[PDB]
Ligand binder design. Structure first.
Ligand code: NA
Length: 129
């Protein structure tokens, strides 16, 4: 599913991301925009053989099992295909583990390069939250 901007904000807010680990909702929306363009089914392959999955582009080396990533961990205890659902719950739950792990939202290179230090409140302006 391809979310609208305010639709995804609302969904993220109901799953408890606003201000999670001190990261306001506009941070998450901004990171989803550039990681995937709001498209749950998104995937992208990395040089090291891993793949990034879903709205938040979560990586199979550490966080999910795809069966084709050697030696990798599955710290979220889920198959990577669960991250492609129209129901973003599974991705949100996994992202809460990522952002708590020590580097905060710097785990998302699109966030670091395109959202960090910007007026990320823009991303939820206009929305009925
Ligand atoms: Na894995």
């Amino acid at each position: 599913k391809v979310f609208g901007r305010c639709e995804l904000a609302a969904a993220m807010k109901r799953h408890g991301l606003d201000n999670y680990r001190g990261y306001s909702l506009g941070n998450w929306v901004c990171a989803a925009k550039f990681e995937s363009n709001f498209n749950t089914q998104a995937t992208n392959r990395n040089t090291d053989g891993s793949t990034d999955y879903g709205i938040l582009q979560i990586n199979s080396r550490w966080w999910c099992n795809d069966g084709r990533t050697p030696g990798s961990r599955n710290l979220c205890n889920i198959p990577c295909s669960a991250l492609l659902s129209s129901d973003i719950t599974a991705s949100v739950n996994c992202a809460k583990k990522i952002v708590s792990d020590g580097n905060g939202m710097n785990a998302w290179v699109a966030w670091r390069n395109r959202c960090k230090g910007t007026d990320v409140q823009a991303w939820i302006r206009g929305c009925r939250l």
